[PDB]
Design a binder for this molecule. Structure first.
Ligand SMILES: *[C@@H]1O[C@H](CO)[C@@H](O)[C@H](O)[C@H]1NC(C)=O
Ligand SMILES: *[C@@H]1O[C@H](CO)[C@@H](O)[C@H](O)[C@H]1NC(C)=O
Lengths: 402, 100, 50, 50
């Protein structure tokens, strides 16, 4: 059994493609195999995504796994809604409720607004990029009026790489006007390293500051260089490295060769690629549940041109959605469950603080329990109590009237 | 619709775009070399083959706030016409130290 | 012009000149003076404060 | 360990100040003084460096 599926991978995404292959081997069965039709395109160009998608549609694909950018996300959400093609992706959660889209990335907005409430913050800096959308930025802006905060949001996205070392230092000289000691980085794991590289250069990582990396990959970026400054650094981690499922994953991952699988001879994995591996298991467990439920998904034939008018949404596509959205398997990104929209539910984002001995998990976030602490023992300082003996005699030691 | 005008051999296209479809116009225009004339909100950057009839309002509002000498105001916005003018009063909120 | 999904899509040559014509059009209209720079943005415009 | 911020002050006690890399402690805030025996503004040195 050859299940034709479409594959859209960014021109840069190398590790994300490597995990897409390991799931193919771990979840392969004598019942059926998946045949990935892979297109290496530029995710930012909406024209390239369009014909890569129109290529897969004419080639008769049952589901498409890929990535979208804030630019081309409209191209995927609009084409997958008319042609009824299912789309699986680890990219950022979308704006609203979109059909035929399986968003592997859980919603971080709720997890971020709880961490600010734990630290009891009231005035911080929100350095955001327009890459992953600003749905998380709208999550702190709409919530700024409710809890009455004061946030200085700076669009760190527009930065020229030649005037980068100048515009970065000049940026924090505006935050130094407020004596700013609390900064939130809402960026991908790459811009975090650049900003951190600039924080250390101007020495704004000493005792007094406090950072929170607002992405699902805390330990993704190099945190060992802001590990010894003095500033508290927090973040979010979706790939738990203490689970036995991931420990068996790392035991097999860290032993591979770095020639065939790029960036794989390491003991870590990015949150974007960890969702890609979990995306394959869901896709295998979706067409496996389509076999058990007896649903013929074999296409009638050539779907024709995507630009068909009137566009023919072939019928067996709407069933593939109900199969994917009913998958509830276990993988790297914890418990995987979706709702009727496609947003990840029943997930668990870990809150991670940065100390001296390395990363440190302090709790987790659930959309029904909010933030929950773990292992409060022991306190940083066990202050002893002093017993002071005295005798009752006026006016030295008396008892109050109440 | 753009692919219809393309095969029909048009020379210039006059139309509109929304926050969701603007990426489709500019990308297909930059790849197939089709001029696009539009009264919609100006694009956020230098997009080729885009004739934006609407003037950039961003500076006119920043100066109007600067005229009245406002320091603490409310900025009600709809996600419809984009948020290019939203980042304008947010990136300038730190230079001039407003409270938006 | 064939299908827009041409692979590879080769662009027609006469289209690039249509931009330079449009971006260099400098006539008068209801929105005041009309001029475009090399980006298509409106320049030399006049927004009236009311 | 962030001991190059505003307040610290280091003296590089060797004849080669501009010999090692200085661009990294250049923006931290601390002052770094040193000694240079090869002046790159002298005309004999510039024809040498050229
Ligand atoms: C939600 O996740 C928890 C993880 O412990 C699991 O026990 C539970 O069965 C999940 N609920 C559903 C409806 O899948
Ligand atoms: C600049 O704007 C004025 C305003 O009417 C206009 O008269 C003039 O032609 C413009 N300059 C150019 C070079 O078009």
């Amino acid at each position: 059994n050859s299940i034709q599926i479409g594959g859209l991978f960014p021109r840069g995404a190398d590790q994300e493609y490597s995990a897409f292959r390991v799931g193919m081997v771990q979840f392969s069965t004598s019942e059926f195999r998946l045949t990935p039709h892979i297109d290496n395109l530029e995710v930012a160009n909406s024209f390239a995504v369009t014909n890569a998608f129109c290529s897969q549609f004419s080639r008769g694909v049952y589901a498409i796994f890929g990535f979208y950018d804030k630019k081309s996300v409209n191209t995927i959400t609009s084409f997958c809604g008319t042609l009824h093609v299912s789309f699986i992706t680890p990219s950022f959660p979308t704006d609203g409720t979109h059909p035929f889209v399986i968003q592997m990335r859980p919603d971080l907005k709720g997890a971020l607004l709880s961490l600010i409430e734990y630290y009891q913050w009231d005035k911080f800096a929100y350095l955001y990029d327009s890459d992953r959308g600003l749905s998380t930025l709208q999550a702190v802006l709409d919530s700024a009026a409710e809890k009455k905060w004061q946030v200085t949001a700076i669009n760190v996205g527009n930065i020229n790489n030649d005037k980068k070392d100048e515009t970065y230092r000049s940026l924090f000289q505006d935050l130094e006007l407020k004596k700013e000691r609390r900064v939130i980085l809402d960026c991908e794991r790459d811009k975090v390293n650049d900003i951190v590289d600039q924080v250390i250069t101007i020495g704004k990582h000493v005792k007094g500051y406090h950072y929170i990396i607002a992405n699902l990959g805390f330990t993704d970026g190099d945190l060992l260089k802001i590990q010894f400054g003095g500033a508290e650094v927090s973040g979010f981690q979706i790939v738990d490295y203490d689970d036995s499922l991931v420990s068996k994953f790392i035991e097999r991952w860290s032993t591979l060769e770095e020639k065939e699988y790029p960036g794989a001879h390491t003991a870590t994995i990015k949150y974007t690629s960890a969702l890609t591996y979990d995306a394959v298991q869901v896709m295998t467990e979706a067409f496996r549940n389509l076999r058990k439920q007896r649903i013929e998904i074999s296409r009638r034939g050539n779907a024709g041109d995507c630009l068909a008018n009137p566009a023919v949404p072939w019928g067996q596509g709407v069933e593939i959605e109900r199969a994917l959205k009913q998958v509830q398997v276990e993988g790297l990104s914890g418990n995987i469950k979706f709702d009727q929209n496609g947003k990840r539910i029943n997930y668990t984002i870990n809150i991670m603080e940065l100390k001296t001995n390395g990363p440190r998990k302090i709790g987790y976030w659930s959309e029904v329990d909010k933030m929950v602490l773990t292992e409060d023992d022991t306190s940083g300082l066990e202050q002893k109590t002093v017993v002071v003996t005295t005798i009752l005699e006026s006016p030295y030691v008396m008892m109050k009237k109440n």
